[PDB]
Nucleic acid binder design. Sequence first.
RNA 1: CGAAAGGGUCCUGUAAGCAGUAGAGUAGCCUUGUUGUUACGAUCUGCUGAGGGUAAGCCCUCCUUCGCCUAGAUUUC
Lengths: 183, 110, 96, 90, 101
Amino acid sequence: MRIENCFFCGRPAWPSKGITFMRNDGKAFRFCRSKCHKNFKMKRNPRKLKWTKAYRKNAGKEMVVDSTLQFAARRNVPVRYNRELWQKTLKAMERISEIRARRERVFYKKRMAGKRAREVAAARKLVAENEHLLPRLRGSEKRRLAELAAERGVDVEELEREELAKLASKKKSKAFGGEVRRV
Amino acid sequence: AIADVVAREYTIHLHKRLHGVTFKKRAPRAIKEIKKFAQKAMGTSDVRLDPQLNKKVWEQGIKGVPFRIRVRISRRRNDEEGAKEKLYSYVQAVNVKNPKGLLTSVVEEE
Amino acid sequence: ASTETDLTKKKITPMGGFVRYGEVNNDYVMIKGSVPGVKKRIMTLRKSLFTHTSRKALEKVELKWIDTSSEFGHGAFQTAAEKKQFMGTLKKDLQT
Amino acid sequence: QALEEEEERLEKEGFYDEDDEEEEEILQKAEYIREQHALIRNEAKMRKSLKNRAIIPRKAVKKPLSQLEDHLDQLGVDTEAIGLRARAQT
Amino acid sequence: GVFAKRTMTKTRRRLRDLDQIERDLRSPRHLQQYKETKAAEDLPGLGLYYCIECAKWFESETSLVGHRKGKPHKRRLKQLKEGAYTHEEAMAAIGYRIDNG
RNA sequence: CGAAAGGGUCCUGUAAGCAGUAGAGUAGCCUUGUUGUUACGAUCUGCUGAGGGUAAGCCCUCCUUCGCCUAGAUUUC
Ligand SMILES: [Zn+2]
């Protein structure tokens, strides 16, 4: 037995999965699921549906140029069976899978390079327009910190930063409404 | 070890409690499930819901109840004379950014 | 759940567990076909009362592959490693 | 073996190598601002029912002194220095 | 509109595929095989007015010239310009190839 | 044990917002055209297999949190 691939979406088609359409020109189409089968019967292009390997390869979001992808092929010339050849093939498959995973992760990071600059610039713009929403201490808290600083001979601004740290640690949410007292 | 007067904020997953419910009955059933949830959480048969909580449940009509809701339940003493139960719970809607990802928390008394 | 021709080291439990049962962590019996019960139900296995008269009872069974994909949907993967190898790197992978 | 030579070549060349506090601070400030914006939108959603009925005008409802006290106090105004108690009617 | 949209996805209501349309455009033998699978006397206009792009027979030359101005014909033209999806593209999407020695 | 949460497994199909020498054309200001420029503009591309949902008869979690507990009543050769 072997593992096919879905014609529409490219997922691994295991035995007894999906359905095959036999066209009268000589084409057999294997679908992994009724989702792909019904999209094919509706004549939707796999290259336009973003959940498919066809779209991902067309958009360049799959690593397609690599040396590790030249090891799997449909072998139309059979090789005489050799135990050592099959064993070293198994070891090769394991190591090639590891190398392919590592290079794929590198490829994805080069896809996602410029993000941190984009969120930094957006964050600076948002803070610049909303300086007034940044956390601040209450007026009564400022009064009590001022009188405590006057009493203790300490730095009022230091007390302000410590109290801001305390409210930064203690996060509290507010509730809508309130109970109406009965007569 | 837990005092009679105590307030906690919970997340109620109303989606699994309203799954398959008739459309003209989903929001009143949501109110009844909130009352049953508060009774199970606090042990109080007397549960009073905030009108803002009722509005929040009814925000999208009779069949548009949110999947999750953040509430505060406050077990308080019933000081009225001739009361059947000495305690009751009051349930309010809580203003949060997102009701997902939140654990059950105890509201500080101050 | 590994055979002589499938060298994936895997257990009998599907991905995401058996639906409404959980995981099989003990010795298990694989029986051809269907049996009268449902999931979680206690089943009594009994020796056959008579000597068999069919060649099927004397056949030796050779398994090549056991399906371990999810039965909670159209599962196309036998292992989580297979699923991750097919999908690739996700956004949450760099977020973590 | 050619693949292994290629792998060690890119490892020597630095192909698999992996790489600010002010940036973290400004990102945390932006996230706090977004949370405050979400809370403001939730308050608006709670108070508005314009599909069915109009909002009562603010001039027709007398604002509570305690609520004005609380809101200005969180906004950072020393209300005792300005005396809202004398301004409040009875 | 579509006639009998309820049974539009039935196999007995199936229409010719776009890759078959490209192969008919590229090679007249494939188109001739498809036309030999039909009967000429039962076709609109006795089979004389045919649009390969739409894979559709028409009653008259003015009807064919008429549908060419329409947007379904232009959708078929843009789909053929983009190219239909084949098994070669399916193998290239997963990085699979054929080794013939 | 219960309620949350986290992870998994599935379902859909790529969120809001921002940006773009992408975008048929149109109109202004001037270098009067040399992406002239600026403005609008279905849609497209990127951030983004992302966002949303997930037991209600899905799975896992002494070792992620918060609660609950040796009752009450009725009957019994
Ligand atoms: Zn498929």
